[PDB]
């Protein structure tokens, strides 16, 4: 099945998932000089004060911190969005080396990692219905660079030992995702897709311009995770990123001058 290896990685995905060669695939390179300021874009509204985290899962591709999305508790609104989008999970993509790991790039620059906060449009009732709609999801993407530690990430880092291998999960309550946000909410936005199979074209991407800084020790602990299950040969969970895909007939809009 699909993964990030030589024989099942991104260049192979189109055989099982032909939408991989579609018209609104993600990620993309953000050419900062070609992105156009759109003064009609509103400020983002990130309302995470009542977020209820539940669990952290190694799914064999990344680790997901999952939230209770049975009520409007942590929501994203405003910006390019119409309506209300509920936080369901976040996860990261990262590299084997600090010079790679992000999915989106900025003027071809690759960051060490990228955080995806995944939200679904409440007008579709559930996540599974939302992913079938062109405006079903809103993903807030945040770049990670290596420098000073991010204090609000440490609780995530310290539980990873307990979910080393595929299929392991651990209770992960009371985690505040506000501790993962940079100061500025300036962003770029474009219509795109999930970045792993099934690669559905259901995402409004909102990518923040300001990266967060994490320490080398923090990202090193991401790289100790495993793609494999327990009792299988160890394959380090690294380079779980899809490279930039053709922009095709899309414009990237900027919220800022
Ligand atoms: C699995 N996966 C990703 O890797 N990156 S993402 O496009 O933000 C995403 C969004 C929704 C569901 C799954 C997702
Ligand atoms: Zn992702």
JSON list of C-alpha atoms in Angstrom, two decimals, residues 117-220:
[
{"chain": "A", "resi": 117, "resn": "UNK", "atom": "CA", "xyz": [-4.51, 21.80, 11.81]},
{"chain": "A", "resi": 118, "resn": "UNK", "atom": "CA", "xyz": [-7.42, 20.09, 10.07]},
{"chain": "A", "resi": 119, "resn": "UNK", "atom": "CA", "xyz": [-10.97, 21.48, 10.25]},
{"chain": "A", "resi": 120, "resn": "UNK", "atom": "CA", "xyz": [-14.24, 20.42, 8.60]},
{"chain": "A", "resi": 121, "resn": "UNK", "atom": "CA", "xyz": [-17.13, 22.57, 7.41]},
{"chain": "A", "resi": 122, "resn": "UNK", "atom": "CA", "xyz": [-20.01, 22.11, 9.84]},
{"chain": "A", "resi": 123, "resn": "UNK", "atom": "CA", "xyz": [-22.62, 22.53, 7.13]},
{"chain": "A", "resi": 124, "resn": "UNK", "atom": "CA", "xyz": [-21.74, 18.99, 5.96]},
{"chain": "A", "resi": 125, "resn": "UNK", "atom": "CA", "xyz": [-22.45, 17.38, 9.34]},
{"chain": "A", "resi": 126, "resn": "UNK", "atom": "CA", "xyz": [-19.42, 15.10, 9.63]},
{"chain": "A", "resi": 127, "resn": "UNK", "atom": "CA", "xyz": [-15.83, 14.85, 8.39]},
{"chain": "A", "resi": 128, "resn": "UNK", "atom": "CA", "xyz": [-16.58, 11.93, 6.04]},
{"chain": "A", "resi": 129, "resn": "UNK", "atom": "CA", "xyz": [-19.23, 13.93, 4.21]},
{"chain": "A", "resi": 130, "resn": "UNK", "atom": "CA", "xyz": [-17.11, 17.08, 4.23]},
{"chain": "A", "resi": 131, "resn": "UNK", "atom": "CA", "xyz": [-14.21, 15.46, 2.37]},
{"chain": "A", "resi": 132, "resn": "UNK", "atom": "CA", "xyz": [-16.58, 14.82, -0.55]},
{"chain": "A", "resi": 133, "resn": "UNK", "atom": "CA", "xyz": [-17.16, 18.56, -1.02]},
{"chain": "A", "resi": 134, "resn": "UNK", "atom": "CA", "xyz": [-14.94, 21.18, -2.70]},
{"chain": "A", "resi": 135, "resn": "UNK", "atom": "CA", "xyz": [-15.22, 23.41, 0.37]},
{"chain": "A", "resi": 136, "resn": "UNK", "atom": "CA", "xyz": [-15.34, 20.62, 2.93]},
{"chain": "A", "resi": 137, "resn": "UNK", "atom": "CA", "xyz": [-12.09, 21.21, 4.80]},
{"chain": "A", "resi": 138, "resn": "UNK", "atom": "CA", "xyz": [-9.92, 24.10, 5.92]},
{"chain": "A", "resi": 139, "resn": "UNK", "atom": "CA", "xyz": [-6.35, 23.22, 6.83]},
{"chain": "A", "resi": 140, "resn": "UNK", "atom": "CA", "xyz": [-4.22, 25.73, 8.69]},
{"chain": "A", "resi": 141, "resn": "UNK", "atom": "CA", "xyz": [-0.61, 25.08, 7.72]},
{"chain": "A", "resi": 142, "resn": "UNK", "atom": "CA", "xyz": [2.26, 26.33, 9.88]},
{"chain": "A", "resi": 143, "resn": "UNK", "atom": "CA", "xyz": [5.94, 26.00, 9.04]},
{"chain": "A", "resi": 144, "resn": "UNK", "atom": "CA", "xyz": [8.51, 24.81, 11.59]},
{"chain": "A", "resi": 145, "resn": "UNK", "atom": "CA", "xyz": [12.11, 25.99, 11.57]},
{"chain": "A", "resi": 146, "resn": "UNK", "atom": "CA", "xyz": [14.83, 24.71, 13.87]},
{"chain": "A", "resi": 147, "resn": "UNK", "atom": "CA", "xyz": [16.10, 27.18, 16.46]},
{"chain": "A", "resi": 148, "resn": "UNK", "atom": "CA", "xyz": [14.63, 27.91, 19.89]},
{"chain": "A", "resi": 149, "resn": "UNK", "atom": "CA", "xyz": [12.31, 25.35, 21.46]},
{"chain": "A", "resi": 150, "resn": "UNK", "atom": "CA", "xyz": [8.54, 25.77, 21.23]},
{"chain": "A", "resi": 151, "resn": "UNK", "atom": "CA", "xyz": [7.36, 25.31, 24.83]},
{"chain": "A", "resi": 152, "resn": "UNK", "atom": "CA", "xyz": [3.83, 24.44, 23.75]},
{"chain": "A", "resi": 153, "resn": "UNK", "atom": "CA", "xyz": [5.08, 21.54, 21.63]},
{"chain": "A", "resi": 154, "resn": "UNK", "atom": "CA", "xyz": [6.92, 19.77, 24.44]},
{"chain": "A", "resi": 155, "resn": "UNK", "atom": "CA", "xyz": [3.89, 17.86, 25.77]},
{"chain": "A", "resi": 156, "resn": "UNK", "atom": "CA", "xyz": [3.51, 16.34, 22.30]},
{"chain": "A", "resi": 157, "resn": "UNK", "atom": "CA", "xyz": [7.20, 15.47, 22.07]},
{"chain": "A", "resi": 158, "resn": "UNK", "atom": "CA", "xyz": [7.19, 13.76, 25.44]},
{"chain": "A", "resi": 159, "resn": "UNK", "atom": "CA", "xyz": [4.35, 11.33, 24.64]},
{"chain": "A", "resi": 160, "resn": "UNK", "atom": "CA", "xyz": [5.88, 10.10, 21.36]},
{"chain": "A", "resi": 161, "resn": "UNK", "atom": "CA", "xyz": [7.84, 7.34, 23.13]},
{"chain": "A", "resi": 162, "resn": "UNK", "atom": "CA", "xyz": [4.48, 5.76, 23.98]},
{"chain": "A", "resi": 163, "resn": "UNK", "atom": "CA", "xyz": [3.27, 5.68, 20.34]},
{"chain": "A", "resi": 164, "resn": "UNK", "atom": "CA", "xyz": [6.48, 4.64, 18.62]},
{"chain": "A", "resi": 165, "resn": "UNK", "atom": "CA", "xyz": [4.91, 2.23, 16.14]},
{"chain": "A", "resi": 166, "resn": "UNK", "atom": "CA", "xyz": [1.95, 2.14, 13.75]},
{"chain": "A", "resi": 167, "resn": "UNK", "atom": "CA", "xyz": [-1.40, 1.57, 15.42]},
{"chain": "A", "resi": 168, "resn": "UNK", "atom": "CA", "xyz": [-0.37, 2.69, 18.89]},
{"chain": "A", "resi": 169, "resn": "UNK", "atom": "CA", "xyz": [-2.39, 5.40, 20.60]},
{"chain": "A", "resi": 170, "resn": "UNK", "atom": "CA", "xyz": [-2.28, 7.13, 23.97]},
{"chain": "A", "resi": 171, "resn": "UNK", "atom": "CA", "xyz": [-4.65, 9.32, 25.94]},
{"chain": "A", "resi": 172, "resn": "UNK", "atom": "CA", "xyz": [-3.84, 12.97, 25.22]},
{"chain": "A", "resi": 173, "resn": "UNK", "atom": "CA", "xyz": [-6.32, 15.20, 27.03]},
{"chain": "A", "resi": 174, "resn": "UNK", "atom": "CA", "xyz": [-6.08, 18.88, 27.94]},
{"chain": "A", "resi": 175, "resn": "UNK", "atom": "CA", "xyz": [-3.61, 19.85, 25.22]},
{"chain": "A", "resi": 176, "resn": "UNK", "atom": "CA", "xyz": [-3.96, 23.48, 24.14]},
{"chain": "A", "resi": 177, "resn": "UNK", "atom": "CA", "xyz": [-3.19, 23.95, 20.42]},
{"chain": "A", "resi": 178, "resn": "UNK", "atom": "CA", "xyz": [-2.93, 27.71, 20.92]},
{"chain": "A", "resi": 179, "resn": "UNK", "atom": "CA", "xyz": [0.61, 26.98, 22.09]},
{"chain": "A", "resi": 180, "resn": "UNK", "atom": "CA", "xyz": [1.54, 25.95, 18.54]},
{"chain": "A", "resi": 181, "resn": "UNK", "atom": "CA", "xyz": [0.59, 29.24, 16.82]},
{"chain": "A", "resi": 182, "resn": "UNK", "atom": "CA", "xyz": [3.00, 32.00, 15.77]},
{"chain": "A", "resi": 183, "resn": "UNK", "atom": "CA", "xyz": [2.36, 35.64, 16.67]},
{"chain": "A", "resi": 184, "resn": "UNK", "atom": "CA", "xyz": [1.04, 36.74, 13.31]},
{"chain": "A", "resi": 185, "resn": "UNK", "atom": "CA", "xyz": [-1.91, 35.23, 11.46]},
{"chain": "A", "resi": 186, "resn": "UNK", "atom": "CA", "xyz": [-0.85, 36.67, 8.09]},
{"chain": "A", "resi": 187, "resn": "UNK", "atom": "CA", "xyz": [-1.48, 33.96, 5.52]},
{"chain": "A", "resi": 188, "resn": "UNK", "atom": "CA", "xyz": [-1.56, 32.76, 1.93]},
{"chain": "A", "resi": 189, "resn": "UNK", "atom": "CA", "xyz": [-4.61, 30.83, 0.70]},
{"chain": "A", "resi": 190, "resn": "UNK", "atom": "CA", "xyz": [-5.48, 28.66, -2.29]},
{"chain": "A", "resi": 191, "resn": "UNK", "atom": "CA", "xyz": [-7.81, 25.75, -3.15]},
{"chain": "A", "resi": 192, "resn": "UNK", "atom": "CA", "xyz": [-6.18, 22.34, -2.92]},
{"chain": "A", "resi": 193, "resn": "UNK", "atom": "CA", "xyz": [-6.28, 18.80, -1.68]},
{"chain": "A", "resi": 194, "resn": "UNK", "atom": "CA", "xyz": [-5.32, 16.35, 1.00]},
{"chain": "A", "resi": 195, "resn": "UNK", "atom": "CA", "xyz": [-1.60, 15.69, 0.76]},
{"chain": "A", "resi": 196, "resn": "UNK", "atom": "CA", "xyz": [-1.86, 11.92, 1.24]},
{"chain": "A", "resi": 197, "resn": "UNK", "atom": "CA", "xyz": [-4.18, 9.40, -0.35]},
{"chain": "A", "resi": 198, "resn": "UNK", "atom": "CA", "xyz": [-7.06, 9.64, -1.01]},
{"chain": "A", "resi": 199, "resn": "UNK", "atom": "CA", "xyz": [-5.80, 13.08, -2.19]},
{"chain": "A", "resi": 200, "resn": "UNK", "atom": "CA", "xyz": [-9.35, 14.45, -2.26]},
{"chain": "A", "resi": 201, "resn": "UNK", "atom": "CA", "xyz": [-9.77, 17.96, -3.66]},
{"chain": "A", "resi": 202, "resn": "UNK", "atom": "CA", "xyz": [-11.71, 19.28, -0.68]},
{"chain": "A", "resi": 203, "resn": "UNK", "atom": "CA", "xyz": [-9.31, 21.70, 1.09]},
{"chain": "A", "resi": 204, "resn": "UNK", "atom": "CA", "xyz": [-9.15, 25.45, 1.43]},
{"chain": "A", "resi": 205, "resn": "UNK", "atom": "CA", "xyz": [-5.48, 25.82, 2.38]},
{"chain": "A", "resi": 206, "resn": "UNK", "atom": "CA", "xyz": [-4.51, 28.64, 4.73]},
{"chain": "A", "resi": 207, "resn": "UNK", "atom": "CA", "xyz": [-0.72, 28.72, 5.14]},
{"chain": "A", "resi": 208, "resn": "UNK", "atom": "CA", "xyz": [0.72, 31.12, 7.71]},
{"chain": "A", "resi": 209, "resn": "UNK", "atom": "CA", "xyz": [3.65, 33.27, 6.65]},
{"chain": "A", "resi": 210, "resn": "UNK", "atom": "CA", "xyz": [5.34, 33.27, 10.06]},
{"chain": "A", "resi": 211, "resn": "UNK", "atom": "CA", "xyz": [7.00, 29.95, 11.00]},
{"chain": "A", "resi": 212, "resn": "UNK", "atom": "CA", "xyz": [7.25, 28.71, 14.55]},
{"chain": "A", "resi": 213, "resn": "UNK", "atom": "CA", "xyz": [10.65, 27.79, 15.95]},
{"chain": "A", "resi": 214, "resn": "UNK", "atom": "CA", "xyz": [11.23, 24.36, 17.47]},
{"chain": "A", "resi": 215, "resn": "UNK", "atom": "CA", "xyz": [14.45, 23.01, 18.87]},
{"chain": "A", "resi": 216, "resn": "UNK", "atom": "CA", "xyz": [16.73, 20.46, 17.26]},
{"chain": "A", "resi": 217, "resn": "UNK", "atom": "CA", "xyz": [15.96, 18.15, 20.20]},
{"chain": "A", "resi": 218, "resn": "UNK", "atom": "CA", "xyz": [12.22, 18.45, 19.60]},
{"chain": "A", "resi": 219, "resn": "UNK", "atom": "CA", "xyz": [12.42, 17.54, 15.92]},
{"chain": "A", "resi": 220, "resn": "UNK", "atom": "CA", "xyz": [14.94, 14.77, 16.65]}
]
